[PDB]
Design a protein around this nucleic acid. Structure first.
Ligand SMILES: [Mg+2]
Ligand SMILES: [Mg+2]
Ligand SMILES: [Mg+2]
Ligand SMILES: [Mg+2]
Ligand SMILES: [Mg+2]
Ligand SMILES: [Mg+2]
Ligand SMILES: [Mg+2]
Ligand SMILES: [Mg+2]
Ligand SMILES: [Mg+2]
Ligand SMILES: [Mg+2]
Ligand SMILES: [Mg+2]
Ligand SMILES: [Mg+2]
Ligand SMILES: [Mg+2]
Ligand SMILES: [Mg+2]
Ligand SMILES: [Mg+2]
Lengths: 81, 123, 79, 129, 46, 156, 205
RNA sequence: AGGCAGCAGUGGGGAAUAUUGCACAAUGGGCGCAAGCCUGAUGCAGCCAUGCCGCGUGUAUGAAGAAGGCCUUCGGGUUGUAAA
RNA sequence: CCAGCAGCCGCGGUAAUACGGAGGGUGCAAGCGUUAAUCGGAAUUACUGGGCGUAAAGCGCACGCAGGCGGUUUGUUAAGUCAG
RNA sequence: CCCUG
């Protein structure tokens, strides 16, 4: 299924999460349909930590996509829960 | 060569064949000595050069020059050879690396030691 | 419109099927001279109205045979 | 036989200009007089004229500034065996902009700078520098 | 000490004369500094 | 004031009844560094004599050229006998990207920012002659515009 | 990672003073500058053009204490940036942190400045940097720590600085032992004996 | 009865390419309502200068121009502020 | 003219800055050389960018199919071409 | 007719 999830890039001990719609059958950082945002867990203050394209997230979840747990949490902070 | 001719027959590249065909695009190749001997060189240079007829692991039969100041290579010695043609010797295109499996280092050398497989003088 | 191509039919001696030479004009990649390129397609011709050497309009369709995936639209001029 | 009258023009200009002829004569055409119009307005030839009704002869009367040849270098590009077409941004700067490229584009023949201002491309007829 | 490869192969009369008529004991040409073979195109250090 | 520089000195040979006569030929280039450059070739029995040969010939043959703030006006080609040279003006701080003889002649001419390449035979004599040919048939936009009968604004 | 021999031998090789000593005495008194190093020092070398290029490049490297791979990556970055490549190269070279400390006068020589950087005597914009190859951005402000306020060598370095010539693109004070770097210098602010177009010739060979 | 061209590894070939490691802590997958289970994917650790990148081997002073070598027209110069 | 070095030119013959060592320098630097392999230099397969009287290179000569190119005017199409 | 490499 099309799935909004976090694919890891970056270096050792310093991850970077690309938030992406991808098929659930495929690899973690392999083939994907479409990037919808990013996430830096190691982003410091006075810069952006993450951005999410909530319009495309809503488009996909209404279109039939499922949501991963971490990205669901991140939607909660970008909507300021 | 007009452009219509080039379309009908494209430009032919040089094949540019290899100088050292025995190594088969490997940097070094292990062999066993089948005949160690000496040979006189071509004009103008004149000396007694030390070469060895070697059978490699891929079955080829080559002649390899031995550098340095005297060797210890005998019959059934397992040596390692590298590329590099010797000008004088007609037919010898390979060198025995010194400090090899059986090629002992050249005695009493304190310059070009890494080329001739020589340890540090303990000082 | 509908994507369709001009060609010159050169052999029709098999029945209910023609082969047409699409004559396209392609620049050479490394020399820059424009080279005449020919392409032969087997075309389903119902009723066999075409002749040798006609000019024919063809259109890609579903596979109708092993080598036939194109069908006639309208004969441009008869020879 | 004869297969490029435009190259015949450019050659006639080069040879007469090297031999220091005041004027050179050839047959005419619309493309020929168009090129002559470009060179008259842009400043390599000084004048040109067409004579005749069924046989139009184009005559090119030339110039020399300090005695030597005004046309320093001159060359046909879009040769019949090898046609040259360029995009908008690929119009060449002949002679680092000092010379011009007679280019035939969709709004007629014009110089390289006129083609660049118009925003068009076409056949690079000749480099004249 | 390595063996010399004589070019006479299998010697069955006299190997000393065989090595003479081998290229090992050949007569050798000396490049004159001046005289007949005198001209040097390029120096040793130039 | 006047910059002077040797490129290469060569030894040539006569053959006579007794033997050989060895003579030295040296070629130099002179230039004030403001686009006013020339070359001189001299033959002598001995090398400094060949040097003042090349000096006096270079000053008496030495000619003038047009420069644009340390670089050429336009790309230019020069051909003399078996040597072809191709030079382009360059941006700020590029340098004299050329061979040996071309390096010498342009850096004594006062060009600072040039790309260059030598095709064909690379004899220094033919190379410097081809380079001086390229400089002398190279032309500048102001004299081009006077030669035009139009303005520098019109041509540029 | 560094050269550990005689700096006066180096200055003898390039024939010119390279600011490689304290400067309390004359370099003529300290050593024989005008003679080449080694046994054949009295020879007058007929240097080839490649020799001139190599000696000028090595002169720049040995004045600025810069390793060769460092210098080659610096040239690559200088060609990457826009404008005069030699100017960008010397801009990067002057923007090296140890050279900034030397020009600011916190270190007597570039060796002392580089040692102080290694031993963490310099705060840069309130955060510690201990690498000499750190690039100081324009309009930055750097400090010296109290551990080197109590250290006596900085006073010697400072008095050597006011006997030496003042850089015009820096603002340094000794009362609070502090400095400010506002702009990248240019050629007239730099020395006139550096031959940068010849340097770019050598690396374009 | 069996199929390491899964991970680690062994033998052999070759000039040559590594540990019979820890953990689901994170990401992701399978199953399950979920807790949770499995995960040699993955996150990490160990070996190799294999490459790139970054730093270290210190800082000033010192003619005694020490020796001992190097050259010598034996006057001396050099190693050499180099050293102690 | 042995021992040897060599990527090329080549050095070694009793006065070797080319062999082996020392001293001194040069260049790199936790790397340094050698070998293997690709590109460049090589405009040395030349499209950009080569040549054929004598350096290698004009079929012994002609006719001619496919193929390549096309004097000039007007109108038309817009395939190539150009612009968005 | 020939002139050791
Ligand atoms: Mg089918
Ligand atoms: Mg050549
Ligand atoms: Mg490093
Ligand atoms: Mg395995
Ligand atoms: Mg093995
Ligand atoms: Mg399990
Ligand atoms: Mg001797
Ligand atoms: Mg090429
Ligand atoms: Mg050729
Ligand atoms: Mg012949
Ligand atoms: Mg011939
Ligand atoms: Mg003929
Ligand atoms: Mg026509
Ligand atoms: Mg169209
Ligand atoms: Mg005889």
């Amino acid at each position: 299924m099309v799935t909004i999830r976090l694919a890891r890039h970056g270096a050792k001990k310093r991850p970077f999460y690309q938030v992406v719609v991808a098929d659930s059958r495929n690899a973690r950082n392999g083939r994907f349909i479409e990037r919808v945002g990013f996430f830096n867990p190691i982003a410091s203050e006075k810069e952006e930590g993450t951005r999410l394209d909530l319009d495309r997230i809503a488009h996909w979840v209404g279109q039939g996509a499922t949501i991963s747990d971490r990205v669901a949490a991140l939607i909660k902070e970008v909507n300021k829960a | 060569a007009t452009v219509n001719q080039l379309v009908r027959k494209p430009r032919a590249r040089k094949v540019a064949k290899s100088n050292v065909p025995a190594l088969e695009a490997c940097p070094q190749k292990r062999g066993v000595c089948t005949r160690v001997y000496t040979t006189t060189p071509k004009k103008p240079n004149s000396a007694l050069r030390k070469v060895c007829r070697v059978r490699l692991t891929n079955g080829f039969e080559v002649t390899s020059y031995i550098g340095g100041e005297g060797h210890n290579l005998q019959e059934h010695s397992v040596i390692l050879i590298r590329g590099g043609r010797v000008k004088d010797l007609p037919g010898v295109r390979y060198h025995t690396v010194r400090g090899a499996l059986d090629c002992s280092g050249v005695k009493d050398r304190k310059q070009a030691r890494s080329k001739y497989g020589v340890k540090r003088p303990k000082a | 419109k509908i994507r369709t191509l001009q060609g010159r039919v050169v052999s029709d001696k098999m029945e209910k099927s023609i082969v047409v030479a699409i004559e396209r004009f392609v620049k050479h990649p490394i020399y820059g001279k424009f080279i005449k390129r020919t392409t032969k397609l087997h075309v389903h011709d119902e009723n066999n109205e075409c002749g040798i050497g006609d000019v024919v309009e063809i259109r890609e369709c579903r596979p109708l045979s092993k080598t036939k995936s194109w069908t006639l639209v309208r004969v441009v001029e008869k020879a | 036989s004869m297969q490029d009258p435009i190259a015949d023009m450019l050659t006639r200009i080069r040879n007469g200009q090297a031999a220091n002829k005041a004027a050179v004569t050839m047959p005419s055409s619309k493309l020929k007089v168009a090129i002559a119009n470009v060179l008259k307005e842009e400043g390599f030839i000084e004048d040109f004229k067409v004579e005749g009704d069924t046989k139009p002869e184009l005559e090119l009367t030339l110039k020399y500034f300090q005695g030597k040849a005004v046309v320093e270098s001159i060359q046909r590009v879009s040769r019949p065996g090898l046609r040259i077409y360029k995009r908008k941004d690929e119009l060449p700067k002949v002679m680092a902009g000092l010379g011009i490229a007679v280019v035939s584009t969709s709004k007629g023949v014009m110089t390289d700078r006129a083609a660049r201002q118009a925003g068009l491309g076409g056949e690079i007829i000749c480099y004249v520098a | 000490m390595s063996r010399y490869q004589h070019t006479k192969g299998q010697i069955k009369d006299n190997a000393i004369e065989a090595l003479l008529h081998d290229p090992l004991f050949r007569q050798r040409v000396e490049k004159n500094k001046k005289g007949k073979g005198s001209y040097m195109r390029k120096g040793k250090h130039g | 004031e006047l910059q002077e520089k040797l490129i290469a000195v060569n030894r040539v040979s006569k053959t006579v009844k007794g033997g050989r006569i060895f003579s030295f030929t040296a070629l130099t280039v002179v230039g004030d560094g403001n686009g006013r450059v020339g070359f001189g070739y001299g033959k002598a029995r001995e090398v400094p004599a060949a040097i003042q040969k090349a000096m006096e010939k270079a000053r008496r043959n030495m000619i003038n050229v047009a420069l644009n703030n340390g670089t050429l006006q336009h790309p230019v080609k020069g051909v003399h006998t078996g040597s072809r040279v191709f030079m382009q003006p360059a941006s700020e701080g590029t340098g004299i990207i050329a061979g040996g003889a071309m390096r010498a002649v342009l850096e004594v001419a006062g060009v600072h920012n040039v790309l260059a390449k030598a095709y064909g035979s690379t004899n220094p004599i033919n190379v410097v002659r081809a380079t001086i040919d390229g400089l002398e048939n190279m032309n500048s936009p102001e004299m081009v515009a006077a030669k035009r009968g139009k303005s520098v604004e019109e041509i540029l | 990672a560094r050269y550990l021999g005689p700096k006066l031998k180096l200055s003898r090789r390039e024939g010119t003073d390279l600011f490689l000593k304290s400067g309390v005495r004359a370099i003529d008194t300290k050593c024989k500058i005008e003679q080449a190093p080694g046994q054949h020092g009295a020879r007058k070398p007929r240097l080839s053009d490649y020799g001139v290029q190599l000696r000028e490049k090595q002169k720049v490297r040995r004045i600025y204490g810069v390793l060769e791979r460092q210098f080659r990556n610096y040239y690559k970055e200088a060609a990457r940036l826009k404008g005069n490549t030699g100017e960008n190269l010397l801009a990067l070279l002057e923007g090296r942190l140890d050279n900034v400390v030397y020009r600011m006068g916190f270190g007597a020589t570039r060796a002392e400045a580089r040692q102080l950087v290694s031993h963490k005597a310099i705060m840069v914009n309130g955060r510690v940097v201990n690498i000499a190859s750190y690039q100081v951005s324009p309009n930055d402000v750097v400090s010296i720590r109290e551990k080197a306020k109590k250290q006596s060598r900085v006073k010697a370095a400072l008095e050597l600085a006011e006997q030496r010539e003042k850089p015009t693109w820096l603002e340094v004070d000794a009362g609070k032992m502090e400095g400010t770097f506002k702009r990248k210098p240019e050629r007239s602010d730099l020395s006139a004996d550096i031959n940068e177009h010849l340097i770019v010739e050598l690396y374009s060979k």
